[PDB]
Amino acid sequence: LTYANPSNMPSEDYKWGVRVANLKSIWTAPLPPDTRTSENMTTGTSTIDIMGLQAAYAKLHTEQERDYFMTRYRDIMKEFGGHTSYDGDNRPLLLMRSEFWASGYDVDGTDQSSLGQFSGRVQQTFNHKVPRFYVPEHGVIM
Amino acid sequence: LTYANPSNMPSEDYKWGVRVANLKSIWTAPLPPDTRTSENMTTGTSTIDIMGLQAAYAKLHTEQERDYFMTRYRDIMKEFGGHTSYDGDNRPLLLMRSEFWASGYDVDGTDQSSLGQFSGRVQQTFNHKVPRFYVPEHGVIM
């Protein structure tokens, strides 16, 4: 999202915020669309290079990995056994994360017409704790 | 060195002796020059034999090994899990081996002109011990 100014983002993207991804299903987490279903190695007319073939496989491997898991530098790095500071790739630092399921209770209708009818009331008490944190430089915590 | 007589070997080869190999570097221990950089398998025009290919790889393997490590019978044998007497391949038997680094000291010049000048003097005491050895047959110990 290379939006320059909020006056550039879709009305509802900046009203309620941009759309997050659905929870992993089979159809809701397809393989990367640019995912190769085949790979050609230009061969000779009546011979193939047994050693070239080998190599062909080594390259496709490196490609496949980038496609499926290391689409991120910080990611192609980690698989090298190294690490990259959130300062190497200018990524906001995730300080804390809370997740929970919100619930509530049903309200029973009791008049002549809506007796046997209910309305679910979702009241969920939650709490989130961001442990003390040392701010290296000036910035915002979102 | 298939020299017949010393009158056949180069002047300096038989004056001071034949040249030994440099100490392993990157450029001083290249891969065998006859080392294959590719290997063709003659394929059909619009099909390859998936099983033939497999085989192709088995042969190249045996070739590659001979090229890199078993250029010697006694060597292609050892990788079979066997052994060959120095009598199987008529090789001189290495009885003892000593290796060391020779050093010395510098001599300080002290006249008007060579005061601040030095000459390195390499005096190295060494010793070599050939443990007792049972001579099976008549021969020379070099």
Short mmCIF file of C-alpha atoms in Angstrom, two decimals:
data_model
loop_
_atom_site.label_atom_id
_atom_site.label_comp_id
_atom_site.label_asym_id
_atom_site.label_seq_id
_atom_site.Cartn_x
_atom_site.Cartn_y
_atom_site.Cartn_z
CA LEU A 1 0.00 0.00 0.00
CA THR A 2 2.00 2.79 -1.45
CA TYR A 3 -0.60 5.39 -0.54
CA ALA A 4 0.93 8.83 -0.32
CA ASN A 5 -1.72 10.51 1.76
CA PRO A 6 -4.93 9.34 3.39
CA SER A 7 -6.65 11.34 0.64
CA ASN A 8 -5.37 8.61 -1.70
CA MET A 9 -6.72 5.51 0.09
CA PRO A 10 -10.23 4.13 -0.60
CA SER A 11 -13.02 5.70 1.37
CA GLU A 12 -13.72 2.58 3.44
CA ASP A 13 -10.04 1.70 3.79
CA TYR A 14 -9.55 4.96 5.72
CA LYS A 15 -12.97 5.02 7.37
CA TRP A 16 -12.91 1.68 9.07
CA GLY A 17 -9.40 0.60 7.89
CA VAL A 18 -7.89 -1.67 5.27
CA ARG A 19 -9.03 -5.25 4.99
CA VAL A 20 -7.10 -7.89 6.89
CA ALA A 21 -6.78 -11.50 5.74
CA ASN A 22 -9.32 -14.23 6.38
CA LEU A 23 -8.46 -17.05 8.76
CA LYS A 24 -6.57 -19.83 7.02
CA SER A 25 -8.86 -22.28 5.19
CA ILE A 26 -8.08 -24.44 2.22
CA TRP A 27 -9.47 -21.99 -0.37
CA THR A 28 -8.55 -18.93 1.78
CA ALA A 29 -4.80 -19.56 1.72
CA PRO A 30 -3.99 -20.68 -1.81
CA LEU A 31 -0.47 -21.22 -2.89
CA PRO A 32 1.21 -18.08 -4.22
CA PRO A 33 -0.45 -17.31 -7.53
CA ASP A 34 2.92 -16.83 -9.24
CA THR A 35 3.79 -20.36 -8.17
CA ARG A 36 5.40 -22.39 -10.94
CA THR A 37 3.63 -25.55 -12.00
CA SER A 38 6.51 -26.50 -14.28
CA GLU A 39 10.08 -25.58 -15.12
CA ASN A 40 11.80 -26.07 -18.44
CA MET A 41 15.44 -26.71 -18.96
CA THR A 42 16.49 -26.00 -22.48
CA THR A 43 17.98 -29.23 -23.64
CA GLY A 44 19.91 -30.21 -26.74
CA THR A 45 18.04 -31.93 -29.57
CA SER A 46 19.35 -35.47 -28.91
CA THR A 47 21.07 -35.09 -25.57
CA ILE A 48 20.65 -33.64 -22.16
CA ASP A 49 23.44 -32.55 -19.83
CA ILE A 50 23.18 -34.82 -16.83
CA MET A 51 25.20 -32.27 -14.83
CA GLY A 52 23.24 -29.26 -16.15
CA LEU A 53 20.01 -30.93 -15.11
CA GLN A 54 21.40 -31.26 -11.54
CA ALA A 55 22.12 -27.58 -11.49
CA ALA A 56 18.64 -26.82 -12.93
CA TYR A 57 17.19 -28.40 -9.88
CA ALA A 58 19.46 -26.37 -7.55
CA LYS A 59 18.25 -23.12 -9.10
CA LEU A 60 14.52 -24.00 -9.05
CA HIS A 61 14.95 -24.82 -5.34
CA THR A 62 16.19 -21.37 -4.47
CA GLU A 63 13.30 -19.97 -6.52
CA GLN A 64 10.64 -22.14 -4.95
CA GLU A 65 11.79 -21.18 -1.43
CA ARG A 66 11.54 -17.46 -2.16
CA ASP A 67 8.09 -18.00 -3.64
CA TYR A 68 6.62 -20.04 -0.76
CA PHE A 69 8.44 -18.80 2.41
CA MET A 70 11.04 -16.06 1.77
CA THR A 71 9.20 -13.34 -0.03
CA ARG A 72 10.78 -11.04 2.63
CA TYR A 73 14.57 -10.11 2.85
CA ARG A 74 14.45 -10.49 6.55
CA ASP A 75 13.06 -13.91 5.68
CA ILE A 76 15.61 -15.02 3.05
CA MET A 77 18.11 -14.00 5.70
CA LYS A 78 16.78 -15.97 8.51
CA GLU A 79 17.08 -19.13 6.42
CA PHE A 80 20.78 -18.32 6.11
CA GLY A 81 20.97 -18.62 9.89
CA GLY A 82 21.36 -14.86 10.38
CA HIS A 83 19.20 -12.08 11.82
CA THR A 84 18.08 -8.64 10.68
CA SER A 85 17.21 -5.76 12.98
CA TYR A 86 13.82 -4.16 12.46
CA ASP A 87 16.18 -1.38 11.51
CA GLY A 88 17.61 -3.28 8.54
CA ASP A 89 14.24 -3.51 6.80
CA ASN A 90 12.45 -0.58 8.46
CA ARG A 91 9.68 -2.67 9.87
CA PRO A 92 7.49 -1.55 12.74
CA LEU A 93 8.44 -3.51 15.82
CA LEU A 94 5.65 -5.71 17.26
CA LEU A 95 5.77 -5.10 20.99
CA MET A 96 2.67 -6.98 22.18
CA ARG A 97 -0.10 -9.15 20.83
CA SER A 98 -3.41 -10.21 22.39
CA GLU A 99 -5.95 -12.45 20.86
CA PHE A 100 -9.29 -13.65 22.17
CA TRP A 101 -12.80 -14.80 21.31
CA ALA A 102 -15.64 -12.44 22.16
CA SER A 103 -18.92 -13.81 23.46
CA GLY A 104 -22.05 -12.82 25.35
CA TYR A 105 -25.58 -14.06 25.99
CA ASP A 106 -28.98 -14.24 24.31
CA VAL A 107 -31.93 -12.08 25.23
CA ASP A 108 -35.30 -13.78 25.31
CA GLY A 109 -38.18 -11.86 23.71
CA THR A 110 -41.36 -12.11 25.81
CA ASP A 111 -44.23 -10.25 24.06
CA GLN A 112 -47.12 -11.89 22.17
CA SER A 113 -45.29 -11.80 18.85
CA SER A 114 -41.57 -12.36 19.70
CA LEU A 115 -42.00 -15.06 22.38
CA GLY A 116 -39.67 -17.83 21.10
CA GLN A 117 -37.30 -15.32 19.54
CA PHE A 118 -33.82 -14.30 20.76
CA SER A 119 -31.14 -11.69 20.25
CA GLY A 120 -27.50 -12.53 20.96
CA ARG A 121 -25.68 -9.94 23.09
CA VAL A 122 -21.91 -10.06 22.76
CA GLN A 123 -20.21 -8.45 25.75
CA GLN A 124 -16.56 -9.40 26.06
CA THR A 125 -14.23 -8.14 28.77
CA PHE A 126 -10.68 -8.09 27.50
CA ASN A 127 -7.29 -6.90 28.64
CA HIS A 128 -4.04 -6.28 27.03
CA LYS A 129 -0.70 -5.72 28.60
CA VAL A 130 2.20 -4.13 26.90
CA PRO A 131 5.15 -4.89 29.17
CA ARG A 132 7.41 -2.01 30.01
CA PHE A 133 9.40 -1.02 26.98
CA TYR A 134 12.51 1.00 26.39
CA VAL A 135 11.98 3.50 23.56
CA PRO A 136 15.35 3.71 21.73
CA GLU A 137 14.40 6.78 19.67
CA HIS A 138 11.50 9.22 19.26
CA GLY A 139 8.43 7.65 17.64
CA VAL A 140 4.81 6.60 17.99
CA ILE A 141 3.29 3.49 19.51
CA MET A 142 0.32 2.36 17.58
CA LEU B 1 58.81 -40.05 -15.14
CA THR B 2 59.62 -42.80 -17.50
CA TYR B 3 63.28 -41.84 -17.70
CA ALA B 4 65.41 -44.76 -18.78
CA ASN B 5 68.74 -43.53 -17.54
CA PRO B 6 69.89 -40.46 -15.64
CA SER B 7 71.39 -39.38 -18.98
CA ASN B 8 67.76 -38.89 -20.07
CA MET B 9 66.51 -36.63 -17.26
CA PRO B 10 66.84 -32.81 -17.44
CA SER B 11 70.11 -31.39 -16.26
CA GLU B 12 68.63 -29.72 -13.17
CA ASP B 13 66.28 -32.62 -12.45
CA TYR B 14 69.34 -34.83 -11.90
CA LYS B 15 71.59 -32.13 -10.45
CA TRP B 16 69.44 -30.98 -7.62
CA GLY B 17 66.49 -33.38 -8.23
CA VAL B 18 63.03 -33.25 -9.76
CA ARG B 19 60.58 -30.60 -8.67
CA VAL B 20 58.17 -31.44 -5.88
CA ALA B 21 54.71 -29.91 -5.57
CA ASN B 22 53.93 -26.57 -3.98
CA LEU B 23 52.05 -26.46 -0.69
CA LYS B 24 48.30 -26.59 -1.21
CA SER B 25 46.79 -23.17 -2.00
CA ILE B 26 43.65 -22.38 -3.92
CA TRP B 27 45.41 -21.83 -7.27
CA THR B 28 48.18 -24.37 -6.43
CA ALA B 29 45.86 -27.37 -6.18
CA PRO B 30 43.36 -26.99 -9.00
CA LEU B 31 40.87 -29.66 -9.74
CA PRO B 32 42.16 -32.32 -12.13
CA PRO B 33 42.44 -30.65 -15.51
CA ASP B 34 40.64 -33.53 -17.22
CA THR B 35 37.73 -32.90 -14.86
CA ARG B 36 34.37 -32.95 -16.63
CA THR B 37 32.30 -29.79 -16.44
CA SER B 38 29.37 -31.51 -18.13
CA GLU B 39 28.12 -34.92 -19.20
CA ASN B 40 25.77 -35.67 -22.05
CA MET B 41 23.33 -38.49 -22.22
CA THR B 42 22.20 -39.13 -25.73
CA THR B 43 18.48 -38.81 -25.55
CA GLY B 44 15.71 -39.54 -28.01
CA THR B 45 14.24 -36.65 -30.01
CA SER B 46 10.97 -36.33 -28.02
CA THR B 47 11.60 -38.58 -25.05
CA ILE B 48 14.15 -39.43 -22.46
CA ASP B 49 14.50 -42.76 -20.67
CA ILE B 50 13.80 -42.02 -17.04
CA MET B 51 15.59 -45.27 -16.13
CA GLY B 52 18.52 -44.67 -18.53
CA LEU B 53 19.06 -41.26 -16.98
CA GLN B 54 19.35 -42.93 -13.53
CA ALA B 55 22.01 -45.22 -14.87
CA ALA B 56 23.78 -42.26 -16.56
CA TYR B 57 24.24 -40.79 -13.15
CA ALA B 58 25.60 -44.08 -11.73
CA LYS B 59 28.28 -44.21 -14.43
CA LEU B 60 29.36 -40.56 -14.11
CA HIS B 61 29.76 -41.19 -10.36
CA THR B 62 32.26 -43.96 -10.85
CA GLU B 63 34.08 -41.71 -13.33
CA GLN B 64 34.12 -38.66 -11.09
CA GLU B 65 35.55 -40.69 -8.19
CA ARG B 66 38.44 -42.02 -10.29
CA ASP B 67 39.14 -38.49 -11.50
CA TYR B 68 39.18 -36.77 -8.09
CA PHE B 69 40.40 -39.46 -5.60
CA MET B 70 41.16 -42.86 -7.19
CA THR B 71 43.62 -42.16 -9.93
CA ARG B 72 45.64 -45.02 -8.31
CA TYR B 73 44.66 -48.81 -8.40
CA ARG B 74 45.67 -49.15 -4.83
CA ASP B 75 43.26 -46.25 -4.36
CA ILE B 76 40.25 -47.55 -6.33
CA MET B 77 40.79 -50.65 -4.22
CA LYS B 78 40.79 -49.08 -0.90
CA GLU B 79 37.37 -47.57 -1.62
CA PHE B 80 36.16 -51.14 -2.15
CA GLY B 81 37.12 -51.80 1.46
CA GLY B 82 40.15 -53.91 0.49
CA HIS B 83 43.92 -53.50 0.72
CA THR B 84 46.84 -53.86 -1.66
CA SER B 85 50.38 -54.77 -0.64
CA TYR B 86 53.11 -52.41 -1.79
CA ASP B 87 53.91 -55.57 -3.69
CA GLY B 88 50.68 -55.48 -5.68
CA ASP B 89 51.51 -52.13 -7.26
CA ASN B 90 55.30 -52.14 -6.88
CA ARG B 91 55.41 -49.01 -4.83
CA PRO B 92 58.35 -48.08 -2.63
CA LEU B 93 57.36 -48.54 0.98
CA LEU B 94 57.40 -45.35 3.09
CA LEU B 95 59.11 -46.35 6.32
CA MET B 96 59.48 -42.99 8.07
CA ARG B 97 58.59 -39.36 7.61
CA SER B 98 59.84 -36.25 9.40
CA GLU B 99 58.72 -32.75 8.79
CA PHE B 100 59.79 -29.50 10.40
CA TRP B 101 60.24 -25.76 9.98
CA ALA B 102 63.80 -24.46 9.82
CA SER B 103 64.70 -21.18 11.49
CA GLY B 104 67.64 -19.19 12.80
CA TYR B 105 68.54 -15.65 13.80
CA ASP B 106 69.45 -12.30 12.26
CA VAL B 107 72.91 -10.83 12.24
CA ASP B 108 73.17 -7.12 12.90
CA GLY B 109 75.55 -5.17 10.65
CA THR B 110 77.59 -2.63 12.62
CA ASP B 111 79.87 -0.64 10.25
CA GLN B 112 79.28 2.95 9.08
CA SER B 113 77.33 1.86 6.00
CA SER B 114 75.40 -1.30 7.07
CA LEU B 115 74.33 -0.17 10.56
CA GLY B 116 70.54 -0.76 10.48
CA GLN B 117 70.90 -3.70 8.12
CA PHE B 118 70.49 -7.42 8.92
CA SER B 119 71.14 -10.86 7.50
CA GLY B 120 68.98 -13.80 8.54
CA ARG B 121 70.93 -16.91 9.55
CA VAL B 122 68.92 -20.12 9.36
CA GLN B 123 70.44 -22.84 11.54
CA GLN B 124 68.03 -25.67 12.25
CA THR B 125 68.87 -28.73 14.31
CA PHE B 126 66.78 -31.66 13.18
CA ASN B 127 66.51 -35.36 13.84
CA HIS B 128 64.91 -38.23 12.18
CA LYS B 129 64.31 -41.67 13.48
CA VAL B 130 63.63 -44.65 11.34
CA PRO B 131 62.38 -47.28 13.78
CA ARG B 132 63.92 -50.69 13.50
CA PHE B 133 62.74 -52.38 10.36
CA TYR B 134 62.68 -55.91 9.10
CA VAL B 135 63.99 -56.09 5.53
CA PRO B 136 61.93 -58.84 3.81
CA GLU B 137 64.16 -59.03 0.72
CA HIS B 138 67.37 -57.50 -0.64
CA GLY B 139 67.02 -53.83 -1.59
CA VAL B 140 68.02 -50.24 -0.93
CA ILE B 141 66.75 -47.77 1.63
CA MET B 142 66.59 -44.33 0.22
#
